[PDB]
Design a protein around this nucleic acid. Structure first.
Ligand SMILES: Nc1ncnc2c1ncn2[C@@H]1O[C@H](COP(=O)(O)OP(=O)(O)OP(=O)(O)O)[C@@H](O)[C@H]1O
Ligand SMILES: [K+]
Ligand SMILES: [K+]
Ligand SMILES: [Mg+2]
Ligand SMILES: [Mg+2]
Ligand SMILES: [Mg+2]
Ligand SMILES: [Mg+2]
Ligand SMILES: [Mg+2]
Ligand SMILES: [Mg+2]
Ligand SMILES: [Mg+2]
Ligand SMILES: [Mg+2]
Ligand SMILES: [Mg+2]
Ligand SMILES: [Mg+2]
Ligand SMILES: [Mg+2]
Ligand SMILES: [Mg+2]
Ligand SMILES: [Mg+2]
Ligand SMILES: [Mg+2]
Ligand SMILES: [Mg+2]
Ligand SMILES: [Mg+2]
Lengths: 118, 109, 134, 35, 103, 105, 112, 408, 53, 43, 81
RNA sequence: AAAAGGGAUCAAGACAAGUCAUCAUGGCCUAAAUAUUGUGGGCUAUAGACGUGCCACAUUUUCCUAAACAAAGAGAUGCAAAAAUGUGAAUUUUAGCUAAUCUCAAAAAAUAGGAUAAAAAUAUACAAGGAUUGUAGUCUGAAAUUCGACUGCAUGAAUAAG
């Protein structure tokens, strides 16, 4: 089925589908299902076409999108523009939270950017 | 609390409530200490004056706290196990076993 | 305790108190070589029952005067008393004063001792200095 | 009569009687205990 | 369960090669080698169901395949027996009897 | 043949049939489970530690009633006291005997 | 330096940093109540905001010797700060050397 | 760049949906290797009520096993596939409970009972014997295999308009499908006597009652058909309406707040679920059964939460029966009680299950030995050994010590 | 099964009796600093003072 | 005027109130009044 | 002060607001842990980094941070030259 | 009872082995500085590379429920119950004990049930995993920015047993 323009398979859990959107986690997932009387173990192919449309209208009123990424990307961009310590660690791809840099800084070198994945 | 014979049943229970965690339901004793002062004589005097207030407050007919049930969550009650009295090999039980020992032989025979 | 008529029970062997320290045998680097140390405290318990309060204090006074070196002692004394402790301790003042008439000679100070200052604060601070901090 | 607080410490008497048992095993001499 | 084991002597077969020689093994060593082969075939098989009987039933099925002769452990038994027959003469090899007797 | 362990029944206490058979093995080996009632009181240790401890306890108590069973309890293994004990941890070792990784270079 | 007594009053192993740590212990003893008062006014959310801010500033102006966090035990025989045992006031090594000679009462080589 | 070594990157048909779950839930009720026990009798329609059958093992009829299997009376944790023919031990507790069901259905009354016991003492199987006595005597058995499937939020649920109740359509549908097969014979003899307006199909009065149940082909109208069916089975004055056995296993699950969430994200109480709200009413006596029957609720220890209200109620009912002037009371400072659980359990009867007697333990061991599954000499010395290792005859523990061992 | 407002009447009685702080709202009153006993004099005596020589 | 696009002034005032906000008020002389000449030697 | 209920960490600073259009000198501070308060906006600081005093001009985006977060103590690590 | 076990101890000599940065000491140097005091910073930097561990890569694992069984150690420079408050870290308030008494304090694995599977390779079925980062808090302490420890929410990297 389709929820907010994303296609999901029948054998997929409705909760795991909602939780696949950025910013939508366990708390929001449990409250969206409770709002429309969907048990956590509901599969995707069992939802009526009426409720599948209600979920799309529900997620459209939430901050679960690139919109949520902008909030995170803006916080990082601000740290750099101000000229703070943390901001300069994102730009150089270095650990930002006081980790030791002599060894084991792989994930920092790979993910720490100004334009992070999210 | 039962040593204070000048108190009534309702008043003795009210005293157990004011004591709070100082009351031991299993032994029925109110143990309370004091080391607030520099000299041991002063700690004894305080407890003496304090026990007089506990009794005066218990006699106060303003609020008997009968609505409040006695709270014993501060105490951890212990359950003791004892040897079963039905297993004691007495002259009466010996006859009981002889019957069971003999019925077993018949059932198999 | 027998001569004083005190029925004593024990000595009850209480559990041993064992401290442990593992230290390197060398002050400098060498760390793969350590050794264990300990300090085991051996202790006993003598409990007296149906003992008169005063008689129990003569027993304790006797043990302290003839204490054996290398032994530490601690006593917990019990005693039954009536209600009205405040008044009881005020009436016994005259009784204790008579017993001290001949004992005041131990202390002596210049008229209006000024080195003491605040009496209560002197005891509180002088007691800490005697005990080494607390 | 007596006090209740007093009676609550008399009943706690589950002591073991000193048996004065007779030794049936041979005992050696204790070690030399240095000072 | 195999009846023999292959022990090797270091550097006695030629240019750094070892001298493999068969030898018998007691019962406990025979059963241990056998059952460990069975567990090796079991662990490599894929999962089938769920519950607490997965591993148990997966092993029992291999025990039945062994008695029916259609198991894979029979190949490992014959493979080690071939090495024994192919090296039955090394029991009296000149190298095993001339260690330090050629001064 | 009623057996109690700390007030609880033999099955309510040991959740492992292997431990139940070992606790009363003396009575089983001599074929006297239905002749005596045992009231055990164990403390400390674990499930198997306590089970094997009751084996020796009942064996000794049983010999007080029928002293002529010791030759049988011998071959049953209920008279011997197993002295095995956990070895302490030793400095320089990860455990009683496990040593840390030794680096040659 | 103002907290260093002009007359040495140490009978243990004297050191440049032992005198330094002894001066901090004496300074904190003299200003612990004054310091506890400030730490109380700050954490008392029932007081006015200005009262809590005044005490928060005065606590920042007190000399460093008055802070208890700057007190670190040292060896009274060697003067080190690493490996000190509170029960003996000595390094792990001086504890070993004195324990084997019999200068620490009650201590003995352990074996079990 | 980095010069360290790095392990450079780099079978069978998979199972179908539901294949794995069906593997650990299938029930085997036979074993060709097992020996046929000689002299093994089959349960007659009135064998679970005779006092003389106590301590004897008898085989279940063939048609009963089809009905019990239809409503999931057997369970995988039970040892059925070790023997050839499903057989049960007629137990002194079976005769007691069964003699009450017999009198209840005959006098038109209703017994509201609760079964309690230790981990594995025969609670779930004592119902299997109650349902067995129900099928053989032409009753209407409505069994709920697992009460945790109604509370753990693992099935669809929808609200009812203008009411706090909640329906579970997908479960109610599956419940009707299994209700037909089990009671196919009894239902064939009954016809409708009321005019049900709202239904997936039009159904005139005096029609085959089995047709009314076949109307529920979709989950949506499943609950509506159920309520209509419930009205028919409980017809006030209609000849041919047999007693009803409304049984539920896992009572501890429906005696707390469920795991479902309402639109406000507040836990729904188990007694609000329309289906659970029906059983509790029948168990509390609120909903009367005009034709009579029995409402049995069996607790469980495997995967069961603790409800102080149910445990307190069970304790109070046993105290009143024994006649003790003092009955257990609430902990005046505990906040784990539930007023609604107390009201439902305020008049039920308790049936405590404990280990079997040494005479019953023999009849059960001889059945295992006759089947070649217990290679031992079944005598008093051997019965007392198993009776002791099983903790005074706990049937569940007696199987682990005799059947699930590694000595034979 | 007893109102909280009714229990406070008993909790307040104990405070008036044993002279303790009655703070049912859990307000941060800094009293944890008042109960903490000083440790200055215990630390000052660490290093032995100069003595006979 | 007084536009905080990043929301740092609103976040501060929400945590510590408007006592430290400039104007024309804990900042009257608490920070400046305590600043004395030669406060710390070495600038 | 991390915990919010204890307020921000304030330190004495010669923060005297100048007359409109007056030339005010920047504030030299070694208090690298002083929280930037809303009243610091518009002021010019010279935060000590251990050796030098790196200049800073407080803006509304810096409120809530520490002064030491704008003066690097170490120099970036660069391999080669 | 018994075919017991472990710990400590393990010499002289060599390695001009380690330590003149515990202490101590000969010679030689510094003595307005190679001595002494504070504020801030640094010892926490990071291309490549080498050692120790921790944890993970799901089917004997992990997750959920429940009414089992330990030993030893710690609290006068302090352990803190019960209750109440908070999703949580934790807070409010101190009963008792300076201890075989009171408190930390609860064992876990196990045992017995239960849930989940095309449990990652067919992209409409992306497993397990918890690094990285955003943000809101708590505790200790003048002080948590360089540079602390935990908590909530979100983010969801490599990782096919080498
Ligand atoms: N009357 C009986 N005849 C034969 N076997 C029985 C009988 N009663 C119980 N058993 C067996 O005892 C074991 C446990 O029985 P059962 O499952 O009914 O217990 P339970 O009380 O429902 O347990 P739980 O609390 O875990 O749900 C099963 O193997 C069962 O077959
Ligand atoms: K171990
Ligand atoms: K994990
Ligand atoms: Mg590395
Ligand atoms: Mg399991
Ligand atoms: Mg059950
Ligand atoms: Mg030597
Ligand atoms: Mg050299
Ligand atoms: Mg070397
Ligand atoms: Mg060197
Ligand atoms: Mg030197
Ligand atoms: Mg410095
Ligand atoms: Mg370092
Ligand atoms: Mg608590
Ligand atoms: Mg702990
Ligand atoms: Mg897989
Ligand atoms: Mg995942
Ligand atoms: Mg930080
Ligand atoms: Mg490896």
């Amino acid at each position: 089925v389709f929820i907010l323009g994303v296609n999901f398979n029948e054998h997929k859990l409705v909760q795991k589908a909602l939780e696949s959107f950025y910013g939508l986690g366990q708390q929001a997932s449990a409250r969206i299902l409770a709002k429309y009387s969907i048990h956590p173990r509901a599969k995707m192919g069992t939802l009526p076409p009426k409720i599948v449309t209600a979920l799309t209208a529900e997620l459209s009123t939430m901050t679960i999108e690139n919109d949520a990424r902008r909030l995170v990307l803006d916080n990082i961009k601000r740290l750099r523009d101000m000229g703070t310590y943390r901001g300069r660690r994102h730009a150089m791809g270095l650990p930002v939270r006081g980790q030791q840099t002599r060894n084991q800084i792989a994930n920092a070198r790979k993910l720490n950017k100004i334009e992070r994945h999210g | 609390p039962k040593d204070l014979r000048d108190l009534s049943e309702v008043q003795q229970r009210k005293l157990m409530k004011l004591a709070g965690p100082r009351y031991n339901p299993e032994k029925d004793i109110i143990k309370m200490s004091c080391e607030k002062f520099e000299h041991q004589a002063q700690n004894k005097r305080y407890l003496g004056d304090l026990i007089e207030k506990m009794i005066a407050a218990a006699k106060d007919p303003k609020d008997t706290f009968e609505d409040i049930p006695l709270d014993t969550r501060h105490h951890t009650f212990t359950k003791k196990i004892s040897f079963p009295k039905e297993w004691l090999l007495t002259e009466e039980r010996k006859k009981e076993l002889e019957a069971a020992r003999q019925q077993a032989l018949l059932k198999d025979a | 305790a027998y001569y004083l008529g005190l029925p004593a029970f024990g000595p009850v062997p209480l559990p041993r108190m064992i401290e442990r320290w593992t230290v390197p045998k060398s002050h400098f680097i060498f760390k793969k070589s350590q050794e264990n140390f300990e300090r085991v405290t051996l202790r006993r318990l003598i409990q007296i029952k149906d003992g008169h309060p005063e008689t129990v204090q003569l027993w304790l006074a006797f043990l302290q005067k003839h204490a054996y070196y290398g032994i530490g002692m601690k006593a917990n004394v019990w005693e039954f008393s009536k209600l009205g402790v405040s008044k009881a301790m005020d009436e016994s003042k005259s009784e204790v004063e008579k017993l001290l008439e001949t004992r005041w000679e131990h202390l002596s100070h210049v008229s209006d001792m000024k080195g003491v200052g605040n009496f209560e604060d002197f005891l509180a601070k002088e007691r800490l200095r005697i005990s080494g901090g607390r | 009569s007596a006090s209740v607080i007093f009676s609550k410490y008399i009943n706690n008497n589950n002591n073991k009687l000193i048996p004065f048992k007779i030794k049936n095993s041979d005992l050696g001499r204790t070690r030399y205990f240095p000072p | 369960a195999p009846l023999i084991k292959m022990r090797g002597y270091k550097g006695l077969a030629g240019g750094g090669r070892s001298l493999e020689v068969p030898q018998p093994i007691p019962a406990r060593q025979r059963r241990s080698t056998a059952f460990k082969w069975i567990l090796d075939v079991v662990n490599k098989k894929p999962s089938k169901g769920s519950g607490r009987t997965m591993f148990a039933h997966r092993v029992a099925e291999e025990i039945v395949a062994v008695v029916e002769g259609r198991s894979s452990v029979w190949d490992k038994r014959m493979l080690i027996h071939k090495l024994g027959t192919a090296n039955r003469a090394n029991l009296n090899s000149p190298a095993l009897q001339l260690k330090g007797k050629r001064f | 043949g009623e057996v109690l362990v700390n007030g609880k029944t033999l099955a309510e206490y040991f959740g492992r049939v292997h431990d139940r058979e070992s606790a009363v093995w003396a009575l089983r080996a001599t074929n006297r489970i239905d002749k005596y009632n045992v009231w055990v009181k164990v403390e400390g240790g674990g499930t198997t530690g306590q089970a094997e401890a009751i084996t020796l306890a009942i064996a000794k108590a049983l010999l007080a009633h029928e002293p002529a069973l010791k030759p049988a309890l011998r071959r049953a293994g209920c008279v011997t006291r197993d002295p095995r004990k956990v070895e302490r941890k030793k400095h320089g070792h990860v455990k009683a005997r496990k040593m840390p990784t030794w680096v040659k270079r | 330096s103002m907290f260093r007594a002009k007359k040495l009053d140490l009978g243990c192993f004297t050191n440049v940093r032992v005198l330094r740590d002894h001066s901090k212990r004496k300074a904190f003893l003299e200003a612990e109540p004054e310091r506890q008062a400030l730490r109380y006014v700050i954490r008392n959310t029932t007081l006015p905001a200005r009262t809590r801010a005044v005490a928060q500033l005065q606590l920042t102006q007190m000399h460093a010797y008055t802070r208890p966090t700057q007190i670190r035990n040292r060896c009274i025989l060697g003067g080190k700060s690493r490996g000190i045992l509170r029960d003996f006031k000595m390094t792990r090594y001086n504890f070993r050397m004195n324990a084997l000679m019999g200068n620490i009462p009650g201590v003995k080589k352990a074996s079990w | 760049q980095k010069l360290r070594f790095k392990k450079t990157k780099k079978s069978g048909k998979p199972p179908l949906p539901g294949e794995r779950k069906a593997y650990r839930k299938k029930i085997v009720l036979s074993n060709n290797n097992a020996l046929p026990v000689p002299g093994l009798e089959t349960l007659r329609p009135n064998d679970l009520a005779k006092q003389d059958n106590v301590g004897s093992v008898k085989a279940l009829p063939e048609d009963v096993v089809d009905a019990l299997r239809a409503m999931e009376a057997f369970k995988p944790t039970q040892c059925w596939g070790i023997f050839r023919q499903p057989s049960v031990l007629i137990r002194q507790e079976t005769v007691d409970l069964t003699k009450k069901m017999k009198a209840a259905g005959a006098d038109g009354k209703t017994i509201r009972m609760v079964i309690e016991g230790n981990r594995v003492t025969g609670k779930s199987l004592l119902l299997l014997q109650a349902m067995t006595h129900a099928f053989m005597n032409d009753w209407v058995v409505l069994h709920i295999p697992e009460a945790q499937e109604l509370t753990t939020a693992v099935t669809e649920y929808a609200p009812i308009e203008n009411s706090p109740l909640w329906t579970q359509p997908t479960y109610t549908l599956k419940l009707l499908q299994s209700f037909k097969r089990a009671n196919e014979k009894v239902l064939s003899r009954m016809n409708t006597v009321y005019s049900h307006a709202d239904l997936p199909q039009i159904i005139p009065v005096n029609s085959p009652l089995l047709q009314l149940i076949n109307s529920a082909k979709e989950a949506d109208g499943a609950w509506t058909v159920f309520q209509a069916l419930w009205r028919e089975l409980n017809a006030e004055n209609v000849p041919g309406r047999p007693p009803i056995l409304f049984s539920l296993d896992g009572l501890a699950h429906i005696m707390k707040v469920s795991d479902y969430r309402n639109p406000a994200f507040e836990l729904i109480h188990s007694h609000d679920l329309a289906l659970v709200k029906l059983f509790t009413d029948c168990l509390s006596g609120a909903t009367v059964m005009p034709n009579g029957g029995a409402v049995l609720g069996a607790t469980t220890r495997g995967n069961s939460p603790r409800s102080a209200s149910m445990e307190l109620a069970i304790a109070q009912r046993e105290a009143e029966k024994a006649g003790e002037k003092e009955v257990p009371q609430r902990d005046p400072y505990s906040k784990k009680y539930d007023d609604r659980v107390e009201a439902v359990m305020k008049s039920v009867e308790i049936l405590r299950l404990k280990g079997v007697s040494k005479t019953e333990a023999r009849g059960l061991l001889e059945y295992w030995a006759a089947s070649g599954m217990l290679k031992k000499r079944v005598d008093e010395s051997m019965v007392s050994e198993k009776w002791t290792l099983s903790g005074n005859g706990v049937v569940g523990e007696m199987e682990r010590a005799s059947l699930l061992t590694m000595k034979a | 099964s007893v109102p909280r407002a009714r229990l406070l009447q008993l909790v307040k009685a104990r405070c008036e009796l044993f002279s303790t702080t009655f703070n049912p709202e859990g307000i941060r009153t800094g009293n944890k600093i008042l109960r903490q006993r000083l440790k200055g004099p215990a630390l000052a005596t660490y290093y032995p003072r100069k003595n006979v020589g | 005027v007084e536009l905080d696009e990043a929301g740092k002034l609103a976040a501060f005032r929400e945590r510590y109130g408007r006592g430290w906000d400039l104007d024309a008020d804990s900042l009257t002389d608490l920070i400046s009044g305590y600043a004395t000449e030669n406060m710390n030697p070495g600038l | 002060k991390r915990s919010v209920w204890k307020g921000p960490h304030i330190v004495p600073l010669p923060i005297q607001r100048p007359e409109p259009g007056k030339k005010i000198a920047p504030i030299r501070t070694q208090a690298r842990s002083a929280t930037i308060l809303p009243n610091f906006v518009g002021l010019k600081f010279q935060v000590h980094n251990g050796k030098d005093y790196i200049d800073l001009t407080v803006t509304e985006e810096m409120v809530g941070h520490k002064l030491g977060e704008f003066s690097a103590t170490r120099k970036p690590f660069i391999w080669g030259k």
